[model samples]
Target chain A: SPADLLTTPVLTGVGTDNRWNGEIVGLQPVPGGFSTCNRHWNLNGSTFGWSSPRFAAIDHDRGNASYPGSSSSNVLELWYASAGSAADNPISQIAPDGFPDMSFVPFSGTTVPTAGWVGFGGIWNSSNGAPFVTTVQAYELGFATGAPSNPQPTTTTSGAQIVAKSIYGVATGINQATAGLFVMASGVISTPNSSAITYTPQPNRIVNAPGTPAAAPIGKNTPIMFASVVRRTGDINAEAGSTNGTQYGAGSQPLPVTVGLSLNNYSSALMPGQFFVWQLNFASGFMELGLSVDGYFYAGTGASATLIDLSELVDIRPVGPRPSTSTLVYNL
Target chain B: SPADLLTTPVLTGVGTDNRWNGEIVGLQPVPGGFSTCNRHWNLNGSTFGWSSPRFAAIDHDRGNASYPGSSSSNVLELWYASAGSAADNPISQIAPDGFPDMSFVPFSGTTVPTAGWVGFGGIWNSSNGAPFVTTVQAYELGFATGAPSNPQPTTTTSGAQIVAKSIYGVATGINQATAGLFVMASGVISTPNSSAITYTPQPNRIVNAPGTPAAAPIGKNTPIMFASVVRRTGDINAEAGSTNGTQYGAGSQPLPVTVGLSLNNYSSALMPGQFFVWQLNFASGFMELGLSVDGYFYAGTGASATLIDLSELVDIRPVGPRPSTSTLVYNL
Candidate 1:
């Protein structure tokens, strides 16, 4: 059948609690309107959304607080909520951005598919939302079927200090997608920063069928299907403190985010005529959305040209006519 | 069996009548050298010649005739006469240019294999011999099997007028190749008026597909096979006409000609390892011939640089290596 416009409580019909993992049923309209909504739904009752988190109120201004003293906490999430409906706000409506602050699993039972994925709509922060010394949306995409777990700590450099960041997945399970799995992260860089740089994501690395990373490097332009996600943290201040007159402004020094996806297998990538069945749990806020195949692009914007209708979920596939050939005379 | 340079009467064991059509029998050289004669045959008794008719005589001149007056009746012939010998003038001997002026059919009986085609060694003209307005050896090509057929009238636009052109095939057969068929036509367009024009015939349009004109349009640049032909019509002039005139001038206004084939269907198109067995019935002419496939080209002329030897018909198909791909960069 066709897709339906799932509301805030889209996950209700698919799974008992919230860890809904199965074939995506269909597409949902981006909440708000095609241009303003970064969230949509699937007929299977799952939700997905993309959002940007703000810095903690105290980290908003460096002039008011000490720079090396405090930092910001900005987190992004692709969560499976208990209920959903087009009319209800998707995420927790917390301060900076009104998006959810914590990640949770709704499922209580076991017997999961051999392997699968969940998407993160935004970025993930680290060090509990500290400014500058932060980990962009790192583990916003947790890798679990329907179980509870703690985030793993990773490290990154922020100015002069080394900060701790968190990522999703239960080590072994995340790498166990049948034979193996890999990841690709794509995001634009922006902020108070100055220089412009072009960064090609690290080539796909083998996560299973394991031995040495030295022996297995993924091919260039290899197709990859989205698997799991690990959002980042929210904005933070130069230092943790009381809400006194000395605290900085809110959501200011928020660093850029790196949103990525996990792939269960390499062959699962999209090809012409292949379909994408995904859902969105529009936690909140608006973020740009786009889909590109072979470098050609398509996007969803507030303008009518890029409008994305969600009255019914949308199905995506690549298509175009075959190229043509002509003639010439050459003297050998 | 490997193709043989069958002497005169090339259709011995194939079928009853001379309409022998299959993978061509093979190549036979022009009995006389390249310049002196248009009529020649093999020991087996097959005849071929080139000729032209006078405008009752006056049409051979501009002053005595009208502006577009008595035109030249230039013709070329490739015939299957009874008891053909190496010594015989297949066409009527005339002035200006001694080429044939009429078309004929010489079939005896039949046990036709459903359908086929036949070929003539020359051209067909509308007006009598004046010199310029001629059908420079036009029979061009004829389609047949081990059967027979008459000729059909098609159309063409030479100089400025819409002149009637004679094309291959009778009102019935021609497009009945179970496997495949190939043809190549080349000729030099000359005149006493000014410069000469080199015209290569257009490819053979598909026939027998109902709802299409008998003389369907042939595409320009179609690949053709030069089975058996030493393209003649060496840059010559009117006053420079006879067996005594300067007959060998070199390349002139050679109009482009198309080369084509009849595949029973699309799959019959060339693949990697195939073969071509054909002959050049060079009644009397010199032509540069070559073949190109996927970027590679090969050609030849009588000069050491491009000489084509018929001692063995050429065989061609794709022969090259496949290209490859490589790269790196990945992280666990």
Candidate 2:
């Protein structure tokens, strides 16, 4: 069954973008379109407010379906992820699907999901905001199936699954849609493999993704998600920067140090397909939130050739219709 | 016809990765598989050496075809992309295709493309080394058609179209197949859009992609790629750092300088999909390749709120097959 789901499996993820363009979290949208009256915006993939086309143009291989909702089977599941604050506990409990609570829904006052729920417990506490490396993944589950094991993707490539999928509501304003889930991947650090110089996105450290459609809620046979999503990928230092750099935890937070790799060092590793993952105890750089690759090519002044004890040489993969969706989506 | 090519069109790109694990450039493979004897490796999609799986796995709707090379119609065209150094100007003269130039083919001594030809003239020059952004794209051109204008994707969204597809041999050695073409995108940089906070990868500042198989050589009926490709997608600091930070230009080119955005300064824009592009007179930061997003969220003591004058709120999209392939591929 797992192997079967591997082929043409429905892909889904959750989470908002950094723009804070719309609302997020809680009783956002129900499965079907929003309540008939609040059709302020439809939940289709045509386009949303402020947000770029929620879905990049469709893949050329999926036949003539360049965009989503072309037909019935090849559909789309979009949600606005513009939240203002951290996510609530067990998001489902906070806003439950709108359909079940429909009658009072349109009048409930909460149309778009702007709750700003995050999937990172390890990073981004309002008290202290620093960058981190997260993976917003859409784990490969299927449509029309039973629930999956809690921590999904038992593939040998994965490690300790990090956070559960973060939640967000469809971005459309008046048209309340169902809650979207951001299944993702997560990981802290691991030993630098002496094996051959190769690797892929280790599932264990995987992070999150956005939510999906109701006909097949994420919980059921639809593609269940998991992950550790980030935006600014390609971090190289392993020496770990300093958490005290910011004055948040207290006031003495040293002015937040800055370090970057010189371009000419080892141009080879910086070339295309050259991804390097490292153990950064010093907290992720200010921008660590997407798929990236960086390396330590210099052992200058007197120390090691790297800025840090770089981690693994991993690869990040996106599974779905809109490719950039793997990188661009609704934000805070 | 141009607008028609916009949806579900055949997407193809060209270029190689960093690991010297495979070969690259010139008359490697042809439109079809390698001629007889050279079956040392089949040009199918079933994992190649040092190179991670060339294709990241098919999307959810191409129907059960997770990996490539499944049927006769929905086929595959792969090649090794290992190479040695700078590109040989008119690469076509290096080694032509085996199919058209069949017979004496297999023994051409070049089963795998090992020529490391890069696509950057504005950046990388062996004389000096540094990380630069270059996109490895698979431009979307339709299948079953005639030739597209030399430069493709006339969408109002694009700009200058940087490099032509960089060539590469399939990673599967011994297979004297078709020469894979990486019909790509290219670009430099334009102005930042102060208009209502919106932008896209300016075609003027776009880049490149990896090579595709024969039947559809990147230059033909396939997607006519054009762009300013880059690996490290997100770039900030409009003021541009300093080329002296590096030294290759002419020695005092100066040591390369490094600048970064703080996480808490303006945590909002640094979140998920918040991408920022800028006019960097300081040459690109060490890494500049792939689809990325970054910002300038602080303004403290002396000068401004950003490290550079971020150009636009752009978005990057991947067209087909393996999603990660949009970011990962063969190299030099």
Candidate 3:
């Protein structure tokens, strides 16, 4: 009835140090040093944002009047990718400036949501790890209108230009174990279980997944899930639960891997300061690269920064926080 | 009906001696010598201009439609004051600059009626019974607008600037005779009529008025007549009027004098190459002077470089042997 708001395999799997807070699916890489990458969840609409205590603390009463005002869940899901062991470059080789150029759709809205709802999601690859965990990298994302056709055929049109530049960053708190790139999904959820989703088998063997392949599916494979991103700014705190927060640091710690998802409109111009997403998968270096809404991606983390990775499922009652005015929606 | 336009008495007794045309009543001693003086006629309005001849024979059939146009009769009248003999300082010495500063009312029309002609007569005193013949003296004339104040008032309520600058006679012409200073008329005569006027009778009944009196009407009992002032330019021609067209190579016989009436409205601006009446009386060695529309005086001889007197009057009715546009006006 509600248009099946969320979709996913829940991307869950438990390991010695792995955890899934419904909103986040962490992949604990194997021994001998496996690579891990954080990704974003694909939002059904344009909603994707995160909440850290300080960020959510300042706007403590923000949910009263949703910024950019929307009823959609201001959700953020974590995705991660882990290639077993790199003979060339490994987990430490995710250099800030060494990521592949990812394409993204444009966000047409005039305003950004209060929740950390970045517009779209696309795939990104890191061949080299960053030096000096304190080194910050920046990126700018933008797009132009769809191109025009010369001999006006009703069905044919040209593709416009998409561009992105970067800004600086600071790494801190959890997830600072050796500094491989990572993303966080820490926002609200709706607690309706009546018409819940049945798990679906992984579609096609994944090319790039998160951590080691489990011998068996435990609770991770029981329920299939899809993240529905709501256009919203993120909240700061929530409790730790099956659908709550998670914390880890950068470096030799086999931190649980996570995912990222981004989205934006395919037909619009990109403006400065708009948001986007990235989606990683569960299997070791295994994940399908599909756009949440077709937008550029980036790894956002700070050293000495707290990680309260809460996806929308944990707090079904939305302790507080709403979707942003600019909600990224998938074309399909 | 209109108060008779000013009728200025130039010289009185016609054809008796070398007398200037146009007039003033008396003479007095100026700064340097016994001299005469008066204001300029209303010559600021007379149109002045020149024309060329076509052939060798001298002709005066300059067209009425030429420079001065058909409306020239209203041009201002001109004359000069001089002593009975050449003296170190003549009447003109009174206003060395030769531009008499005075304002008069202009004539009323562009074309004064031909029947209402204008003339100049003079009085002369002779030592011998022989009439003093003079070829280098003429009563130069001009015209100017009257009703308007000098520096004509503009449409704006504010008064106009005084345009008192002389319209004629600033340039020094060639002098054919060693001339002396005399008395002359400075203003315009609006009325033109044949009337004889004489110097007021002097005290002490005596037919022979003293050589020079101590006061009023300095040349007592002197007979006056009009004569053309002569100036040399090009070749010598006998047919041309004796005074204007002749050059005395030693003792050349001088021409006789003629006196007539002159009439003009004050409105006509003085133009170049136009003629005015000259009055002459007894044999006197005095020469003539001219009045510019703006009150400047010059030696008037009628013999301007381009103007050569002809034996017979060329009919101005048709464009003649001269330049088709050359004007020929009678009843000067």
Using lDDT as the measure, the top candidate is: 3
Could you give candidate 1's per-residue lDDT for residues B1-332 as a string of tens digits? 11222221222111111111111222222111111111222112222222111100001111111111132121121221111111222332121122211122222132111111211111211122111111111222322222123333121111111011112111111111111111111122222122222211212211111121121111111122222211121211111223323212121001011001110122222243222222223334322222121211112211122223333322322222211110000110
Docking class of 1: incorrect
* Worst 10-residue lDDT window, candidate 3 chain A: A53-62
- What is candidate 2's CAPRI-style docking category based on DockQ? incorrect
Candidate 1, what DockQ? 0.00
What are the interface RMSDs of all the models?
43.3, 21.4, 59.2
Candidate 3 regions exceeding 4 Å error are A1-105, A113-332, B1-332
Instruction: Estimate the TM-score for candidate 3.
Output: 0.14
Rank by TM-score (best first): 2, 1, 3
What local lDDT does model 1 show for residue B194?
27
- Fnat by candidate, in order: 0.00, 0.00, 0.00
Better of 2 and 3 by DockQ: 2
lDDT of 2 at B232: 15
DockQ of each: 0.00, 0.01, 0.00
The candidate, 2 or 3, that scores higher on TM-score is 2
Using all chains and alpha carbons, the TM-scores for the candidates as numbered come to 0.15, 0.18, 0.14
